Amino acid sequence: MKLIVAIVRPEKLNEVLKALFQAEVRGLTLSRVQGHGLHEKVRLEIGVSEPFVKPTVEAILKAARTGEVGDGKIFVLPVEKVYRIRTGEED
Amino acid sequence: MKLIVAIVRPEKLNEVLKALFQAEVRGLTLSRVQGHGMELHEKVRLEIGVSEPFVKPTVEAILKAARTGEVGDGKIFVLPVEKVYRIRTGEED
Amino acid sequence: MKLIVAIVRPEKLNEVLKALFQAEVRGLTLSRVQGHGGETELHEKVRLEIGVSEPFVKPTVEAILKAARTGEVGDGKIFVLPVEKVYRIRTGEEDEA
Ligand SMILES: Nc1ncnc2c1ncn2[C@@H]1O[C@H](COP(=O)(O)OP(=O)(O)OP(=O)(O)O)[C@@H](O)[C@H]1O
Ligand SMILES: Nc1ncnc2c1ncn2[C@@H]1O[C@H](COP(=O)(O)OP(=O)(O)OP(=O)(O)O)[C@@H](O)[C@H]1O
Numbered sequence: 001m002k003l004i005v006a007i008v009r010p011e012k013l014n015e016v017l018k019a020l021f022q023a024e025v026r027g028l029t030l031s032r033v034q035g036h037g038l039h040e041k042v043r044l045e046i047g048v049s050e051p052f053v054k055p056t057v058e059a060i061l062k063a064a065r066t067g068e069v070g071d072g073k074i075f076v077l078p079v080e081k082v083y084r085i086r087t088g089e090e091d
Numbered sequence: 092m093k094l095i096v097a098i099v100r101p102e103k104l105n106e107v108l109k110a111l112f113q114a115e116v117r118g119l120t121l122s123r124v125q126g127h128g129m130e131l132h133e134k135v136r137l138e139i140g141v142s143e144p145f146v147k148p149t150v151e152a153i154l155k156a157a158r159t160g161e162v163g164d165g166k167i168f169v170l171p172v173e174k175v176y177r178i179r180t181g182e183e184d
Numbered sequence: 185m186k187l188i189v190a191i192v193r194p195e196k197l198n199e200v201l202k203a204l205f206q207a208e209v210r211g212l213t214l215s216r217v218q219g220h221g222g223e224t225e226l227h228e229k230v231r232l233e234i235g236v237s238e239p240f241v242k243p244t245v246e247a248i249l250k251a252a253r254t255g256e257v258g259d260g261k262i263f264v265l266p267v268e269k270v271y272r273i274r275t276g277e278e279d280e281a
C-alpha cells in the first residue's frame with residue numbers, strides 16, 4: 001500500500017477526479033490548501049494498492065498539467081498498515 | 092514513532108475523541124475534508140503521532156469508536172516516521 | 185526525499201515562512217487545523233507540508249525549530265516522513281534521491 005499526496009490547481013480538480021474515476025481509483029480524500037512553488041490549491045490524499053500507484057500518478061499528471069508554473073507535485077509515501085473501519089479489519 | 096491518519100464520519104468524531112482520551116491519547120491534529128469512496132462527502136481527518144508500543148491500542152480505539160457497519164466508515168493509515176521533533180525544546184523524538 | 189509536516193502557532197507562521205525562504209526552501213503547502221497536545225479543548229494551528237531533497241532536511245527542520253519556538257506549551261511538532269518518489273506535474277520529472 002502507498003499513500004499518494006497530490007497538490008493541483010482548483011480549476012483542474014474536476015478534470016483530475018474524472019480521470020481518477022476512469023482509472024478505477026475511487027477512494028480518496030481532499031481538502032483546500034494554500035501553497036508556494038500563497039496560492040489556493042487542492043490537496044488529494046489517495047491510498048492505493050501497489051498496482052494502482054502508476055495508474056493514479058499518471059491520471060493526475062495528465063489531467064492536472066497546464067504547462068504553466070504552479071501545476072503542482074505528487075508525493076508517493078510508504079504505508080505500513082491500512083485498516084477498513086467498517087469491518088475493523090486490517091489489510 | 093508512527094503517524095496515524097484516520098478518516099471518519101463527522102457524526103462519529105466526538106465518540107472517537109472520547110475513546111482516544113480513555114485510551115490515554117492526548118496529542119492529535121484534526122481537520123475537515125471531503126471524500127469519495129462524482130459525489131464528495133464530508134469527513135474528518137485525524138492525524139496522530141504515536142510511539143510504536145502504542146500504535147495498536149490507538150488504532151483499536153479509533154476502529155471501535157468510528158464504526159457504524161455501513162459503507163462510508165472510512166480508513167486508518169499507519170505511516171512510518173523518520174524523525175520527530177518537539178518545537179518547544181527542539182529535542183529529537 | 186522526505187515530506188516534512190510541521191504544526192505551529194498561527195502567530196508564528198510569518199516568522200517561519202521567512203526563515204524557510206531565507207534557507208532557500210520555497211516549495212510548501214499549508215492549511216489551518218485544530219489540535220490538542222499531550223499536555224493542556226482544541227486550539228487552532230497551521231500545518232505546513234514541505235517536500236524536500238535529503239540535503240535540505242536538516243536546514244528546513246532547523247529553520248522551523250528556530251522560528252516557531254516560544255518555550256510555551258502549544259509550540260507544536262515536526263514530523264519528517266519518508267517519501268518513495270516525487271513527481272513534478274508540469275515537467276513530468278521524478279525524484280527519488
Ligand atoms: N516542495 C513542496 N512541498 C510541498 N508542497 C509543494 C512543494 N512544491 C510545490 N508544492 C505545492 O504545489 C504547488 C505548485 O507548485 P509547483 O510544483 O507547481 O511549483 P513551480 O514553482 O510551478 O514548480 P517547481 O517548484 O517544481 O519549480 C505549490 O503552490 C504548493 O501548493
Ligand atoms: N483509499 C483511500 N484513500 C484515501 N481516502 C480514502 C480511501 N478510501 C476511503 N477514503 C476516505 O474514507 C471515506 C469513506 O470511505 P468508505 O468508508 O466509503 O470506503 P469504501 O472502501 O469506499 O467503503 P468501506 O471501506 O466502508 O467498505 C472516503 O470518503 C474518503 O474520505
Ligand SMILES: Nc1ncnc2c1ncn2[C@@H]1O[C@H](COP(=O)(O)OP(=O)(O)OP(=O)(O)O)[C@@H](O)[C@H]1O
Nearest residue numbers: 118119139140179219220221222223257258259260
Ligand atoms: N502526537 C501528536 N500527533 C499529532 N499532532 C500533535 C501531536 N502532538 C502535538 N500535536 C499538534 O501540535 C499542537 C501543539 O502541541 P504541544 O506543542 O501542545 O505538544 P505537547 O507535547 O502537548 O506540548 P509541548 O510539545 O509544547 O511540550 C497540538 O495542538 C497538535 O495540533
